[PDB]
Amino acid sequence: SNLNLFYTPSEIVNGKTDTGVKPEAGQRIRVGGMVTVGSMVRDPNSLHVQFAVHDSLGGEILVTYDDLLPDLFREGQGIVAQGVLGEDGKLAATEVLAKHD
Hints:
Elements: E1 6-7, E2 28-35, E3 41-42, E4 49-54, E5 60-65, E6 78-87, E7 90-97
Main location: membrane
GO cellular component, one term: plasma membrane
Function: Heme chaperone required for the biogenesis of c-type cytochromes. Transiently binds heme delivered by CcmC and transfers the heme to apo-cytochromes in a process facilitated by CcmF and CcmH.
């Protein structure tokens, strides 16, 4: 089966996907961290959407999404996104759970 585990965005930059050392494009993981106010950008297409997400670790990872996000993905909260690493540096995620409450 495909595993499922939650990891910090800032972690999964430095010496991880970006640098392709430990993880690799192919594995499914969940990024979990805080979205910055100006992070969310949608296409005029209105199906393609991408967002930067970060943590106190002071690294920002870009996540890409290829349908309409739930609640348009409201900014300035902390969500979890499940995705597979595919874009040797970016992660393709469609299962975002905004359990911020």
